[PDB]
Structures are given as structure tokens and as C-alpha cells.
């Protein structure tokens, strides 16, 4: 019964502790610190008139898409600041968006419980909603594209789903979280994905089968952001306890914790650099931090946002970092 | 420096900016209300009088456009999406008077209202409080006195005194009385007067905000 569970939890904790021979801090203590990092506001995307909750970079590292309470997504050309597209939304309460890896579709969702997909390369010229993906019974946290046909989705229904856009329904529902799931991160090979939830747990899911491959705990509050390491064998979570963490899929435990006494504020977004050396965590203290992922030392600070930094992204070629904040302005560094 | 296609792209961006500015002005002229309450608190009746997930009810009164956001379909954690409603100019909190004699839900309304009125996000948003199902209360108080709901009640078992005690409890649950205010009201099973009260509360909030911008409040 439940005592058997408890015994299994004790056994798995003992196995993790036995396998944790050393720590990332002492393993990478000898490496040269990256030094101070200075990041100027290379571009300032302005035109949003309400708090920005999400953005996603295109696969070409030039276009991006941002969602806010304006009731409309905006597709920006980050190189020249031009607004490529402005897609009016059916619901103004949008807290997620994604840009398809092929660049053809753009998804967005929120309190409407629907991850709507919009077609960008239509023949008529105006972006139109191709599908209205409904079936979640709670607010929508983050829906991420797999390809032009499949899309994983994380909602407050305590479950993550894998919808097929062509038919419009779920083909695999990932259940097992206790509370609201607020984050997603597809593996670079797109075969597994980690979802962080409000029960202070991040679960490694396998899309092909559907079972919860692994679970990772250690946070002391709700998890707000998650992002795979570029290698695809690790992932960093950012929660409300003002601590980031870097868990390993193969070791099935954390390796480093990113925290400081000065920061007593939760993490609203987490992303990695192209090489995985830098961990850019956008906090709710109106700013972002840049952590040496191998040393847990704050390698830089990104200030300039008048409000909470809600969304953060790093270009696929690592050339720039774009942070969107509640002050309705995106900043590309 | 910019070729023909780049110039036309910049022109398209400027047109998009114009449309975005127009839409933003139109949306800023709107009045945003957040509707809250219990499942059997009569919010369905109230929205019927003015007319899956969130429910938007749009209506117009005295050339003012009100959008009521009902979040009754959200069963997740309140704090995880309550920060989205910072900009609402008022919170229409509906509480049923029939909740005092049917089970524990009166304490549920107490705690929900306390949390709503003590959120860090809603520290400056006025709460328009509606007392719904008052006609049934007026005759069922004699059958079930308010002392059953709260033994600490000390007064005549009349509907007027019970209503006064309720609107004293709700206001005592407030903690930010100096910044925000609770505009309590009784539905009286009518629509026009309810909407008129809502409009009065909204315009009072607007004038208070203008005095705040002036420096007076």
C-alpha cells in the first residue's frame, strides 16, 4: 500500500545519495571563471501596451513572437525592429506562445484553456487560426511545437498533453503531477521533455510512449520556468523560492543550485546559452541574472526593465537574448 | 541604406503601429471588472440581468463599456493567474445570503473575500460587493436565525439587523481601508438599479484615481 510507496521513496533516495559521489562545485572548481558579463540593450521592441507574459524565438534566430494582455500577438523582426505581424487574439488573457520550428505556425494560449494555432504563410495574406485546440479543463501555461503537426501543451489541469493539429485532439495525455504545471522544455532531439509543476517537482516525460520517465524534486515552492541544457542531458528549473537548480537526467538528481541572499524573489523565466555555460534567469525583481552554470557564480546582471521580467529567450544561434517584461517592452541584448 | 522592400516593410510596420495604437486607445477607454464569488452566489443571476474557461460579459451603460471577467471556470490555484487581473478597475464580489444556514460555505466566503481583499495585487482595486438572494433571506431568517450561523451574533433576529451585521463583517475583514474601499450593495432582485450602482461605483473609482493623479485622493 502507501507504506510500500514510502519504502520505494526511501530506496530511491538512498540510491541517489549513493550515486552522488561528488558535486559539480568541486568538480568544476578548477575551471577558469567566465568573468564579468556586460550586455547592452541592442534592440528595444516597443509596441505592446500591456504586460508581456511570453515570447518565443523563431528557428532562424531573427523573427520572434510575443504575447501580452493587448489581446494580440506580435511577430517582430528583431534585426530591424519591424513588426512583421500583428495577430488579434480571441481572448486577451494569453500567457504563452510558441513559434513553430518550420516557421509556418504560431501558437498561443491562456485562461481560455485553448492553445490556438495561427497560420503565417497563408495564401490569403492575413494570418488566420488554423485550429482551436481545446480539451484542457484548466488555465493554459505553455504549449510548445514539436513539428508542424504535433504540439505538446502544459496547463493547470495538472496534466500535459500531446495534440495532433491536423485532427485537433490529444494523442497522449501525460498525467501524474499533483498541481498546476507551469512550464515545458522540449529536448533538442525532441524525444523527451521536462515539465515543472506547482507541487515543487519537474517530471521527465517521454512523448512516444507517454509514461513519466523520471521525476525530480528539491524545490521548496512552485516551479515557474524550466529549460533543457543544450546537451539534452540536463535541465534547469526556476521556482518561487528564489533558487534555480540544474538537474541531470542520467544522474536523476540536482547538481548545482543558483541562489543568493540578496535575491529573495522568485524566478519567472529560465533559459540557457548556446554552449550551456551561461544560465539566464529572469527574476521578478525587475531584472535578470546570468549565472555561471558550472560555478553557480552570478556572472552578470541584466537591468533595464521597469517591471517584472516575465519571459526570456535565447536565440538558437546564441547571438542575442531577448527578455520581455511586464512593462510591455522587449529588450534584445 | 534601405532598399525598396525594406522601405515597404518599414511602412507596413508603421501601419501596424497605427492600428495597434488605435486598438490600445479603444481598449484603454474600456472598464474592466473582475467577477468573483461562490458557485451558488448568484453571479449567474447578475450576469443574466446584465445580459470552459474565463467568461467575458460585455455590456454598456451610460456610454461606458464594461467587460466582466468571470473566472468561475478556473479550478486551479488562484495566485497563479490572479496577477493577470492587476488592471481591473473593480472586483464585483457576489455573496449569497442563503449561505449562512446550508453546509460551512459562509466561512468559505469569509476566507475567499479575506484573501481577495488582502492580495498584494488588489491593494488599490475597489471591491463592489453584492448581497445576492436577499428576498429568500428576508423570510428564512425567521425560520433559521442568524445565531445558528454565528453564535456571537447579539441582536434582534430581523433581516435589517442581520444584513447590517453581514455588511459589518465583510468590511471588518478589509485591511486596506485607507487605500481601497468596499462598496456594499443589496441586489433587491432588480437589474437597472444594480447596474446603476455598479456604474456609480466605477465612476467613483475613476474620480478617486483622478484625484490621486492630482495629488489629493
Amino acid at each position, epitope marked *: 500500500l502507501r507504506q510500500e510507496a514510502e519504502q520505494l521513496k526511501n530506496q530511491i533516495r538512498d540510491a541517489r545519495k549513493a550515486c552522488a559521489d561528488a558535486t559539480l562545485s568541486q568538480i568544476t572548481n578548477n575551471i577558469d571563471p567566465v568573468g564579468r558579463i556586460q550586455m547592452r540593450t541592442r534592440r528595444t521592441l516597443r509596441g505592446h501596451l500591456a504586460k508581456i507574459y511570453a515570447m518565443h524565438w523563431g528557428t532562424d534566430s531573427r523573427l520572434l513572437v510575443s504575447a501580452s494582455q493587448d489581446g494580440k500577438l506580435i511577430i517582430w523582426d528583431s534585426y530591424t525592429t519591424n513588426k512583421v505581424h500583428a495577430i488579434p487574439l480571441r481572448s486577451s488573457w494569453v500567457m504563452t506562445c510558441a513559434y513553430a520550428p518550420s516557421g509556418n505556425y504560431v501558437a498561443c494560449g491562456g485562461l481560455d484553456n485553448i492553445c490556438s494555432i495561427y497560420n503565417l504563410k497563408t495564401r490569403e495574406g492575413n494570418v488566420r487560426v488554423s485550429r482551436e485546440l481545446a480539451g484542457h479543463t484548466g488555465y493554459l501555461s505553455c504549449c510548445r511545437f514539436l513539428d508542424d503537426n504535433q504540439i505538446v501543451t502544459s496547463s493547470g489541469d495538472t496534466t500535459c498533453a500531446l495534440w495532433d493539429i491536423e485532427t485537433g485532439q490529444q494523442t497522449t495525455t501525460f498525467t501524474g503531477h499533483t498541481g498546476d504545471v507551469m512550464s515545458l522544455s522540449l529536448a533538442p532531439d525532441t524525444r523527451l521533455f521536462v515539465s515543472g509543476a506547482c507541487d515543487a517537482s519537474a517530471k521527465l516525460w517521454d512523448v512516444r510512449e507517454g509514461m513519466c520517465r523520471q521525476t525530480f524534486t528539491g524545490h521548496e515552492s512552485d516551479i515557474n520556468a524550466i529549460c533543457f541544457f543544450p546537451n539534452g542531458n540536463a535541465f534547469a528549473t526556476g521556482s518561487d523560492d528564489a533558487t534555480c537548480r540544474l538537474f541531470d537526467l542520467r544522474a536523476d538528481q540536482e547538481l548545482m543550485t543558483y541562489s543568493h541572499d540578496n535575491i529573495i524573489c522568485g524566478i519567472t523565466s529560465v533559459s540557457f546559452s548556446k554552449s550551456g555555460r551561461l544560465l539566464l534567469a529572469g527574476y521578478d525583481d525587475f531584472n535578470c541574472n546570468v549565472w555561471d552554470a558550472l560555478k553557480a557564480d552570478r556572472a552578470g546582471v541584466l537591468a533595464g526593465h521597469d517591471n517584472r521580467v516575465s519571459c526570456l529567450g535565447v536565440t538558437d544561434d546564441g547571438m542575442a537574448v531577448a527578455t520581455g517584461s511586464w512593462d510591455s517592452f522587449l529588450k534584445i541584448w | *541604406t534601405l*532598399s*525598396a*522592400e525594406d522601405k515597404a516593410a518599414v511602412e*507596413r510596420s508603421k501601419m501596424i503601429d497605427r492600428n495597434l495604437r488605435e486598438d490600445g486607445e479603444k481598449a484603454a477607454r474600456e472598464v474592466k471588472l473582475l467577477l468573483l464569488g461562490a458557485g451558488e452566489s448568484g453571479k449567474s443571476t447578475i450576469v443574466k440581468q446584465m445580459k470552459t474557461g474565463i467568461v467575458e460579459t460585455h455590456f454598456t451603460f451610460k456610454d461606458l463599456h464594461f467587460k466582466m471577467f468571470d473566472v468561475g471556470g478556473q479550478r486551479s490555484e488562484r495566485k497563479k493567474w490572479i496577477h493577470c487581473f492587476e488592471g481591473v478597475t473593480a472586483i464585483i464580489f457576489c455573496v449569497a445570503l442563503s449561505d449562512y444556514d446550508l453546509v460551512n460555505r459562509m466561512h468559505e466566503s469569509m476566507k475567499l473575500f479575506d484573501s481577495i481583499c488582502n492580495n498584494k495585487w488588489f491593494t488599490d482595486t475597489s471591491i463592489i460587493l453584492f448581497l445576492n438572494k436577499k428576498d429568500l433571506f428576508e423570510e428564512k431568517i425567521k425560520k433559521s436565525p442568524l445565531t445558528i450561523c454565528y453564535p456571537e451574533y447579539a441582536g434582534s433576529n430581523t433581516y435589517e439587523e442581520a444584513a447590517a451585521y453581514i455588511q459589518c463583517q465583510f468590511e471588518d475583514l478589509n485591511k486596506r481601508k485607507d487605500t481601497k474601499e468596499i462598496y456594499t450593495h443589496f441586489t433587491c432582485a432588480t437589474d437597472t438599479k444594480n447596474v446603476q450602482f455598479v456604474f456609480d461605483a466605477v465612476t467613483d473609482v475613476i474620480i478617486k484615481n483622478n484625484l490621486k493623479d492630482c495629488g489629493l485622493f
Partner: single-chain antibody
Amino acid sequence: QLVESGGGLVQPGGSRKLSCSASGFAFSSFGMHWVRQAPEKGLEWVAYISSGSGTIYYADTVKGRFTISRDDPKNTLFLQMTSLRSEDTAMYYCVRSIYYYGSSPFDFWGQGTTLTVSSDIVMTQATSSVPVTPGESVSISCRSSKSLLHSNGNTYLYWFLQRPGQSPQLLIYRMSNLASGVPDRFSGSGSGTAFTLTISRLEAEDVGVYYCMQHLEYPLTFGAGTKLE
């Protein structure tokens, strides 16, 4: 679906109104052009109006004699011609074009309407006729006076294919990209000055005249045209 009207016989020195009715796309966000083709010569750009009518351009040969206007609520593009010359006789094509990042300008061309009357970058396409057989590759060469490789990396050169008795269609945009729905056979290549269009596994549907246009700056000038048969 663009269809034009208002052509026909006109006395020289007169005036005529050409109406382009559009149906099936967002006319408001689409820039429109007007490209005329002589009864025997190649295409020649005539007029251009942007989205919202904020920007208007004309060919320097006919500057000020034509007036191009838009009616988005009516969804119709008008072109008023005054004081026609005998050389003005041509078939006019209403050409859609939307400009943003990654868009495909000049993608859809109207059916065109005929009209008979009693420092610019010059593009050379001297290979006038190429005798070809089905199933064999072919290469068409175009040359520009000024390099089209702009400082932002875009090489503004378009390849159009006009079938005998059919309106021209966009074939390749920006010297590399393939227009939507075009067979994968076609490829574009070349430096900023000399450009090549290569067709592999040629079939009968490839018979026609190929034109190279430059979109680096106005006026837009087409090539002489290469005829394949």
C-alpha cells in the same frame, strides 16, 4: 483572384480608366502594382501603390500621365490614363505584392486586359531563344548593370515565367527562394551581377518566356525575355 477591365480601342490623346477587382485575399495589406506588356515586347513596370495608399510610384517614361488609386472598402485598384501615346498600347497586368520579412512579392498576377491605341538598372537577357527538349536541363542567364546584392544580404532579383496565352506567374523570388506551389525543378543562383536560372527535368508545361526583374529600386526593369521551345 484578380481580374481587370476597362481596356479596348482608344483614340490617341484620350483618357481611359482601368479597374482591377480583387477577391480572395486581404487587399488592405497587399501592395499593388501595374505592369504592362507590349504586344510583342517584354514586360515593363508602369505603376505601384503601397498598402494604405501611403506610397505611390510611377515609371519615369510615363510619370505624371497616370494616376493609381486604391479603394480598400470597395476592394478595387484603379488606374487613370490621360493623353495616351501610340506606344502606350499594351496588355496591363494587375500584380499583387506584399512586403515584409520573408514575403514573396509579385506572387500573383492578374489575367491582364488589353488596350490598343491608334541611371535606371538595365537587365540584359540576350539569350532570346533556347531550343530545348523535354527531360533535359536548361540554364537562362540574366545580367544587371548594377550589383543587386544589397548591404543586408538580399539579392533582389525575381524570375517570372509567362506561358503562351497565360498571365505571368512568379517562379523564383530573391534569386534563391522558390515561390509557393512552384515545382522543385527550378533553381536560382549567381553573384550580385550575373544570375542563372536552372531547370532540371524539363516538361512541356515549361514552354514559355522567362523574365528577370530587379526589385532593388524603382523603376523596376524587366529583362528582354528568353523563349523556350
